[PDB]
Design a protein around this ligand. Sequence first.
Ligand SMILES: OC[C@H]1CNC[C@@H](O)[C@@H]1O[C@@H]1O[C@H](CO)[C@@H](O)[C@H](O)[C@H]1O
Ligand SMILES: OC[C@H]1CNC[C@@H](O)[C@@H]1O[C@@H]1O[C@H](CO)[C@@H](O)[C@H](O)[C@H]1O
Ligand SMILES: *[C@@H]1O[C@H](CO)[C@@H](O)[C@H](O)[C@H]1NC(C)=O
Ligand SMILES: [Ca+2]
Ligand SMILES: [Ca+2]
Length: 360
Amino acid sequence: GNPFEGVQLWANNYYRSEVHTLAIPQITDPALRAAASAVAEVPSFQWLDRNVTVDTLLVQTLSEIREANQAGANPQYAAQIVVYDLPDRDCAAAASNGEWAIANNGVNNYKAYINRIREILISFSDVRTILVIEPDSLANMVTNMNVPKCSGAASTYRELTIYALKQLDLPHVAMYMDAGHAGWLGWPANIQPAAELFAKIYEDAGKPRAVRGLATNVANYNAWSVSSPPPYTSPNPNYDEKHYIEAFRPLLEARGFPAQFIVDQGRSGKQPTGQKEWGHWCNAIGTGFGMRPTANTGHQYVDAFVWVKPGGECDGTSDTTAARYAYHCGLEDALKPAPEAGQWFNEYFIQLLRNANPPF
Ligand SMILES: OC[C@H]1CNC[C@@H](O)[C@@H]1O[C@@H]1O[C@H](CO)[C@@H](O)[C@H](O)[C@H]1O
Ligand SMILES: OC[C@H]1CNC[C@@H](O)[C@@H]1O[C@@H]1O[C@H](CO)[C@@H](O)[C@H](O)[C@H]1O
Ligand SMILES: *[C@@H]1O[C@H](CO)[C@@H](O)[C@H](O)[C@H]1NC(C)=O
Ligand SMILES: [Ca+2]
Ligand SMILES: [Ca+2]
């Protein structure tokens, strides 16, 4: 039942175009240019981070996959898409604040966005589609109820999550709900409360067939499995994603949710990282491209290692005067100067390339 089995993963043209139009013209070294071109072919998730992406980038990518598959691709290609446009998005940090606000028609806007995505996916029932649903949202509901914007958004996040899970429960779709990372929900105190929250949402959505499990480490830098805990992980015993998942799955399973996992490794190649504290998430120094996307995980509970966050796309601006400035992005272990979240950050791309493991 692994939705990553029996397909290959399509590398999308948005990221390929970033690398060829924004990155490569800035690289002169012949070997580095060639390595950059190779990264552009690694199949990372495409993000529906703005409403305008639905009718443009989603439809174009599904059209291109259809065309490649009709031309005889073997194995057939599958799409990898992130749904990331909740109103009052990114409730615990300014950096990825979205286009919609709950107080300004955000619920209606989001339900329409989900409905349009559904319409598109139904029309592309010939393209196997793997979705990650709303990075950070439910993890914020576990740990950030002390933050007024998160507390105020919780009931809306819950309603809209259940809406998405039901609406996008289509026969050719597999969904993974975002579930934080080892250094967030994997702390032993947070992990049972997290299991309870995720299992109840699953139950309240009616246990949709298409919900395959959870995504972890999205846009973070954790190791899958290292023998020695990186110093910044102390004193969390769940110091890597393998520890987190092996602790988390039994808890979820006892509560009726036999979740399979995908694990982001797109910025996990260099361990330990240059994070001075584990909570430093923004444009972290000392990181590299990590293990390539694969279903060959060597672990029963892990469907795939994936590249969810596309390395080179910024985590947040370092401009202290900007509306979306988060103090995390101005720290000494954040690469600077950095552009707005989601925009291309070429010096970061080069860092990831230099530190890539396996190398390009
Ligand atoms: O309060 C949120 C913290 C808790 N500690 C872990 C830290 O990662 C988390 O911050 C979020 O980190 C994710 C990436 O893992 C970011 O995408 C969020 O923007 C940030 O709030
Ligand atoms: O992980 C979700 C957000 C919030 N914090 C980490 C950061 O990297 C991420 O930003 C989003 O990244 C995606 C993929 O690059 C972009 O589409 C978004 O514009 C951006 O906000
Ligand atoms: C979102 O995009 C759709 C087309 O996909 C459009 O009809 C709708 O008006 C847009 N939503 C908002 C709130 O602008
Ligand atoms: Ca397997
Ligand atoms: Ca290696």
